[PDB]
Design a protein around this ligand. Structure first.
Ligand SMILES: CC(C)CCC[C@@H](C)[C@H]1CC[C@H]2[C@@H]3CC=C4C[C@@H](O)CC[C@]4(C)[C@H]3CC[C@]12C
Ligand SMILES: CC(C)CCC[C@@H](C)[C@H]1CC[C@H]2[C@@H]3CC=C4C[C@@H](O)CC[C@]4(C)[C@H]3CC[C@]12C
Ligand SMILES: CC(C)CCC[C@@H](C)[C@H]1CC[C@H]2[C@@H]3CC=C4C[C@@H](O)CC[C@]4(C)[C@H]3CC[C@]12C
Ligand SMILES: CC(C)CCC[C@@H](C)[C@H]1CC[C@H]2[C@@H]3CC=C4C[C@@H](O)CC[C@]4(C)[C@H]3CC[C@]12C
Ligand SMILES: [Mg+2]
Ligand SMILES: [Mg+2]
Length: 1352
């Protein structure tokens, strides 16, 4: 399967530069911006005709390829990739939150299975969770092939969106480039032949990569010519999708080291996979040596690294090895930007956590790190970051980013993060939308708060996804912008997912008269001082999101918002109804939605269970308080109590519960005592003054009197008694003879049936709809009993003295009495014994109909046959038909008319069917014998069997249906007037008088009673406490099941085996461990800052002043900066100046004495000083400002390198130092801070001033006191000669070194290092012997570490 057709694309959606939407443009128009080079000689190039899709063997999908020039814009390539994704997966494609650049070895290599599996699993998890763009080299060898193999399982095991695998490769090495170039673009499904013999090129593309950018420069069979574009694309993609770029380094050669060096220099973090060998092992060794505080790394040395580098890369020259070592040490200088993953240290499936660790150390703002922590589903990491931010005084940034972080957590359906963000003092009703809503002319829309617009954004964002049920539900709803059912356009579409309209849609989903009441006026700032307002604001906000979470069927988030708010049961019933109706709605039908549909139905059942469970818990704890809770009217749903809600939600399970039934029975009896049976209420009803006071003052006796007759049970009793007299009086009237005029009893019955007709009309028009009224069968029976009487009365009243009219009137009134007595069975439904039995009967009527259809066959067959057999010579008449129907129907009830049959057959014998006139009539008994065998033996007994089966089947459902009808009857007799049927006319004239006085007169109103806030908060507190108690009991109960215990035992064993696997791994490591347990300086030729002026070159064996060297001819060159004569520069003529002693220039002493034992010798010919430290191939002062000894002061502010835990880092058994070093502006090499000693100052002042100027720049309070305390203890450790490249034979640098050591490290930690003046960057760097530092500063720190017994 899965091969239908292939059709070429003609138009593409290219995203605009604003980043807001995609515009449709022609493929050749968009694709014009890419160029190709026909040859190496060519520079301008020609427009690219090489783009399309490549089809690779054993791969179902095709991978797009585009050949683009080196001069092409990386933004255009990014647009091409974006356009492809937009074309394939629609406009709303999953944007990448991570760019994973995979670098390493070009040649093939084998990794250990555990490490490869861990790396593959972690990379697959990271890529699938963040929708990451993986950028590799694209060739079918090494780390690119490994990455392709890793991403292949992700492309196979997952449906819909597949994360792109972009391969950026040099076109000049790719097999099949000529085939790809030739043709008319685009080449749809072009076959790629990796085994085809391309002569010059030998590198094929990897078949598992999803896209391909072939960078062309016209060269052939040269590698490495795309690296800069690749870096530029990754940076461009990173800026466009606001995503960090994370490089992953697996194995690798020397160019991978240079690539990694470039990556950290550009701020991009790297993840080094330790244990993969080669350059990765070198990088891992270097970091672990420089940063890791564990005990097993304390034996790490540079000598062993150098040995490792020499044994691994095998350089041709020593300088290459030194440069490689220097580059490797330069990569791991910043500990945050390199994260090393190792199999023997880190755990299995923790590779995505490392990637996340690199991400945290990469992005500086708090919000981006939390968003990324959400994507990888690492709550603990987010919790630790939040706790650390809370402890370190970063509380303001937390509040600034929580809203967006909380919003992001809700869109991606992560409640656990929702709980985290909400726990750190983030108010739920303070959400803010990402975009700004435009102003609307409607006042209802303008009244809406900020959070409402945030939900509107969640609805819009979820709705824009393909084949979303939300869009179909809103479109099918056929409502306007405010949700009213009325069915300009721009306003109706841009804010089509506002919360009011959604509230209206959910209201119609519940029932026909459900209307949720919102009050957004409480969110204004003027009501903040009112007590308890927060809870209300919380509860309302929670409710609105709760409804949103019900719509998207996110059960866990729904349960969380349901728990946060109040009115738990009603909300669970409403939720159950909305899901259940939504699960069978027209908007959710479709082939792809099946699992979704199933999930909603499941969730509906769960919510129903919750509503029952919480109710049960309440009734278990306090029955009276549970009754008070069920009777409470809630303002949000039009003052409807929980039972009204339950009936509207059609929750049979809730209504059949004993707590609910107790409340309904209490409502029936009207909360009075000593009123349970029929006889008690009947006795109290007939004798009001003798039983009521003695049951449990004027306002007591009067209250009890007003309470008893307002009870619905009392109105039933009045209605029964009224209907019973009606039956008795009408029965007497039909039995007694009619008089010659209209009698008095007839007039009484006329008045009584008009009163019943007026009540039926009042119920029909002024109490319910006509459809609702006719639906009920008892209302239909009522209409028949009224029509039959009036037909009967008018038949008699038309001619009262006519005998025939009286006879016809009694004939109609016979049915009237039959219906009346049948209607009297309506009042049996209130009884717990008679009521279900009545519903079962109505169920058994179908079986009665089945029996009637089967008997009808035998009755008409036997009847026609028997009647014909008895009378074979009679003309057909009506009597023949009566003979067919009469006897056969009664013979089934045991009345057999055998004597009558014998008389009709004209058989004169003593034996019944002997000596007859015709022999055929003797067959009359035989037919009947068969007939009564068919009817009484077979059919009646079959009916008994069917009724037995039917009862057992529908008894429980009938009982539940009776419990719903109990409320229905209670609700019906609550609003019905007290006065019975003949007197109801008085009640009717009273209601008409009240309606006339209210509508026209307007002299009155309605009064009611509202429950106090104390009792309201008591009900709220009780309901919340029992909700929590039920959830605790429910969780413990589901954990004590057998299936759960077996599953928990299984997971516990596996995890025990995992720990055992780790234990053996450590043993195998121990087995291995136990098994193995048994100097003249010559300056450079070109003088610095001289504009290319070169010295006179000399060999290193001619450096000593003791050696003669007669061919020494130095060049006299002086720099323009020194020749311009600044304040700190000595005069150009060095005559009359005294050396080897402290000399005064402008009355200030300068250090003109050198520490060299021979001293400075003065040339007699020119007066210039002669350098005692050797020849430099240059006379004159050069770039140095002072003749002879230029006194410099260097400041080495040092501290012990400590881990966070507080332990001192220890290498080679000695403690390791760390000093502030600045990177020089002129030659971009790191160096010790320092400068020339100023006039009138000592090394103490010079050292302090230089340290403040370079490392600190502009500099307080406590930090100034710490710096002064640190600067109060300085020791002059050395006064040596500098090996500075600006030194000449007449001007040389001599340094005094001042060391400021921070033993505790408290004072050093307050310094904000930032490069200024003649320094580019300043940082704390560790002192060691492998440092590639400026001049002879390695000797100076060596002296510092020698003096302070520190590592070197
Ligand atoms: C829905 C049910 C209740 C309908 C009942 C219809 C009743 C009221 C009507 C329908 C047909 C009527 C019968 C039609 C004709 C006659 C013949 C006349 O010489 C005497 C009355 C008699 C016998 C009528 C009695 C009343 C009657 C049975
Ligand atoms: C398989 C079933 C339907 C077979 C039915 C057989 C019927 C058609 C036959 C079988 C025997 C027949 C009867 C045999 C003899 C007599 C006596 C004669 O003076 C009158 C007719 C009468 C009484 C016959 C009536 C028709 C009869 C009942
Ligand atoms: C229908 C199948 C199952 C059985 C058929 C049996 C019928 C054909 C038999 C059973 C008993 C029989 C009757 C028994 C006796 C007599 C008396 C004789 O002087 C005339 C025929 C007459 C009246 C028979 C007519 C046929 C009869 C009705
Ligand atoms: C166990 C049950 C099924 C026993 C069956 C009894 C049958 C065989 C008996 C019961 C009544 C009998 C009938 C009674 C009377 C007459 C009238 C006579 O002039 C001819 C035989 C005839 C028509 C009989 C035929 C056989 C009969 C139908
Ligand atoms: Mg709650
Ligand atoms: Mg009625």
């Amino acid at each position: 399967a899965m091969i239908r057709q292939s059709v070429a694309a003609k138009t593409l959606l290219i995203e605009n530069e604003d980043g807001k939407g995609s515009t449709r443009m022609e493929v050749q128009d968009f694709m014009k911006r890419f160029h190709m080079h026909a040859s190496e000689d060519d520079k301008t190039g020609s427009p690219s005709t090489a783009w399309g899709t490549l089809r690779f063997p054993t791969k179902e999908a095709t991978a797009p390829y585009l050949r683009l020039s080196v001069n092409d814009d990386p933004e255009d390539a990014l647009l091409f990739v974006k356009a492809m994704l937009a074309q394939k997966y629609g406009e709303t494609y999953d944007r990448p939150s991570l760019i994973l650049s995979v670098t390493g070895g070009a040649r093939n290599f084998t990794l250990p299975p555990r490490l490869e599996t861990a790396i593959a699993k972690g990379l697959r998890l990271a890529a699938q969770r963040t929708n990451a763009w993986v950028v590799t080299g694209g060739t079918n060898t090494g780390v690119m092939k490994l990455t392709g193999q890793i991403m292949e399982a992700l492309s196979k095991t997952q449906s819909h969106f597949i994360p792109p695998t972009i391969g950026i490769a040099t076109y000049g090495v790719i097999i099949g480039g000529d085939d790809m170039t030739r043709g008319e673009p685009p080449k749809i499904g072009l076959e790629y032949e990796m085994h085809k013999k391309d002569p010059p090129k030998t590198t094929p593309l990897d078949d598992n990569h999803n896209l391909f950018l072939l960078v062309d420069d016209g060269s052939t069979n040269k590698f490495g010519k795309e690296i800069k574009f690749r870096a530029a694309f990754e940076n461009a993609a990173g800026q466009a999708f606001a995503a960090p770029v994370v490089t992953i380094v697996v194995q690798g050669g020397p160019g991978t080291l240079g690539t990694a060096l470039q990556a950290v220099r550009q701020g991009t973090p790297i993840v080094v996979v330790d244990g993969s060998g080669l350059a990765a092992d070198v990088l891992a060794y270097a970091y672990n040596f420089m940063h890791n505080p564990l005990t097993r790394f304390k034996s790490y040395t540079i000598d062993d690294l150098r040995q490792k580098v020499a044994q691994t890369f095998n350089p041709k020259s020593s300088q290459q090895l030194t440069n490689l070592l220097d580059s490797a040490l330069e990569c791991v200088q910043d500990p945050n930007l390199v994260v090393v993953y190792s199999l023997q240290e880190s755990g299995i499936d923790e590779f995505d956590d490392c990637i996340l660790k690199a991400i945290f150390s990469s992005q500086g703002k708090l919000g981006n790190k939390l968003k990324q922590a959400m994507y990888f589903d690492q709550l603990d990491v987010a919790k630790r970051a939040l706790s650390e931010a809370s402890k370190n005084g970063q509380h303001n940034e937390i509040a600034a980013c929580i809203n967006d972080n909380l919003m992001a957590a809700m869109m991606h359906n992560k409640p656990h993060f929702v709980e985290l963000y909400l726990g750190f003092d983030a108010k739920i009703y303070e959400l803010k939308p990402s975009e700004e809503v435009a102003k609307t002319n409607i006042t209802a829309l303008d009244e809406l708060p900020s959070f409402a617009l945030a939900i509107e954004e969640l609805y819009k964002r979820e709705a824009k996804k393909p084949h979303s049920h939300v869009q179909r539900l809103v479109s099918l709803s056929n409502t306007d912008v405010l949700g009213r059912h009325y069915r300009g356009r721009d306003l109706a579409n841009t804010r089509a997912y506002n919360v009011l309209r959604m509230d209206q849609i959910f209201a119609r989903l519940v029932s026909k008269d459900f209307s949720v009441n919102r009050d957004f006026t409480i969110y204004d700032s003027k009501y903040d001082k009112v007590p308890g307002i927060q809870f209300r604001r919380t509860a309302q906000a929670s409710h609105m999101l709760f409804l949103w979470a019900i719509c998207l069927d996110r059960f866990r988030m729904a349960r969380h918002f349901w728990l946060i708010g109040d009115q738990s049961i009603i909300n669970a019933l409403v939720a159950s109804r909305i899901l259940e109706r939504l699960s069978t709605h027209r908007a959710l039908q479709g082939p792809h939605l099946a699992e979704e549909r199933a999930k909603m139905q499941h969730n509906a059942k769960k919510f129903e269970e919750l509503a029952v469970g919480v109710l049960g818990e309440c009734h278990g704890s306090d029955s009276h308080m549970a009754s008070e809770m069920l009777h409470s009217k809630n303002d949000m749903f039009n003052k409807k109590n929980a039972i009204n809600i339950a009936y509207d939600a059609k929750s049979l399970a809730f209504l059949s519960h004993p707590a609910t039934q107790s409340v309904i029975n209490a409502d029936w009896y009207g909360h009075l005592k000593s009123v349970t049976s029929f006889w008690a209420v009947l006795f109290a009803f007939f004798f009001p003054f003798f039983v009521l006071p003695f049951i449990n003052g004027a306002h007591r006796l009067r209250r009890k009197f007003a309470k008893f007759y307002s009870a619905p049970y009392t109105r039933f009793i009045s209605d029964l008694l009224s209907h019973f007299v009606l039956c008795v009086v009408t029965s007497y009237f039909v039995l007694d003879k009619l008089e010659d005029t209209i009698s008095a009893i007839e007039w009484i019955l006329l008045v009584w049936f008009v009163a019943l007709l007026l009540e039926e009309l009042r119920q029909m028009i002024f109490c319910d709809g006509i459809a609702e009224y006719i639906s009920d069968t008892w209302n239909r029976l009522d209409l028949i009993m009224i029509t039959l009487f009036f037909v009967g009365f008018f038949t008699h009243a038309s001619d009262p003295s006519n005998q025939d009219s009286k006879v016809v009137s009694k004939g109609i009134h016979a049915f009237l009495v039959v219906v009346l007595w049948l209607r009297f069975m309506r009042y049996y439904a209130l009884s717990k014994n008679l009521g279900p039995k009545l519903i079962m009967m109505m169920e058994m009527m179908k079986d009665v109909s089945t029996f009637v259809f089967l008997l009808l066959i035998f009755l008409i067959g036997y009847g026609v046959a028997a009647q014909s057999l008895l009378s074979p010579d009679e003309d057909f008449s009506s009597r023949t038909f009566i003979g067919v129907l009469f006897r056969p129907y009664f013979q089934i009830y045991g009345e057999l008319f055998l004597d009558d049959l014998n008389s009709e057959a004209n058989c004169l014998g003593d034996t019944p069917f002997t000596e007859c006139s015709r022999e055929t009539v003797r067959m009359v008994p035989f037919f009947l014998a068969v007939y009564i065998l068919g009817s009484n033996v077979l059919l009646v007994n079959l009916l008994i069997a069917m009724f037995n089966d039917t009862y057992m089947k529908v008894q429980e459902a009938a009982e539940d249906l009776w419990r719903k009808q109990n409320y229905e009857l209670c609700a019906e007799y609550k609003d019905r007037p007290f006065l019975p049927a003949p007197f109801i006319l008085l009640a009717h004239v009273h209601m008409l008088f009240m309606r006339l006085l209210r509508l026209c007169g307007v002299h009155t109103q309605e009064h009611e009673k509202i429950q106090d806030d104390e009792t309201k908060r008591k009900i709220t507190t009780f309901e919340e406490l029992n909700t929590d108690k039920f959830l605790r009991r429910w969780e413990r109960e589901r954990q004590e099941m057998l299936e759960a215990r077996v599953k928990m035992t299984n997971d516990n064993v596996v995890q025990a085996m995992g720990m055992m696997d780790q234990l053996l791994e450590h043993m195998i490591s121990f087995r291995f461990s136990l098994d193995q347990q048994a100097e003249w300086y010559v300056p450079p030729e070109e003088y610095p800052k001289s504009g290319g002026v070169k010295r006179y070159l000399i060999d290193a064996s001619m450096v000593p002043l003791s050696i003669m060297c007669p061919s020494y001819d130095p060049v006299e060159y002086t720099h323009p900066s020194v020749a311009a004569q600044p304040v700190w520069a000595d005069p150009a003529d060095p005559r009359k100046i005294k050396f080897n002693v402290k000399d005064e220039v402008n009355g200030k002493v300068v250090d003109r004495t050198s520490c060299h034992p021979s001293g400075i010798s003065i040339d007699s010919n020119t007066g210039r000083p002669i350098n005692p430290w050797g020849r430099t191939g240059m006379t004159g002062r050069g770039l140095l400002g002072k003749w002879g000894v230029n006194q410099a002061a260097d400041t080495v502010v040092t501290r012990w390198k400590r881990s966070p835990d507080g332990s001192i880092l220890e290498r080679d058994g000695k403690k390791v130092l760390e000093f502030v070093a600045i990177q020089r502006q002129d030659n971009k090499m790191w160096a010790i801070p320092g400068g020339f000693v100023d006039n009138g100052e000592d090394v103490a002042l010079t050292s302090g001033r230089e340290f403040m100027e370079e490392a600190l720049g502009m500099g307080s309070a406590e930090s100034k006191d710490s710096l002064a305390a640190l600067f109060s203890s300085g020791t002059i450790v050395a006064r040596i000669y500098c090996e500075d490249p600006r030194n000449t034979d007449n001007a040389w640098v001599e340094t005094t070194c001042v060391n400021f050591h921070d033993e505790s490290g408290r004072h050093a930690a307050r310094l904000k290092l930032q490069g200024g003046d003649d320094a580019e960057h300043a940082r704390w760097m560790m002192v060691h012997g492998g440092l590639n530092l400026f001049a002879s500063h390695r000797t100076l720190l060596q002296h510092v570490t020698s003096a302070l017994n520190a590592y070197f």
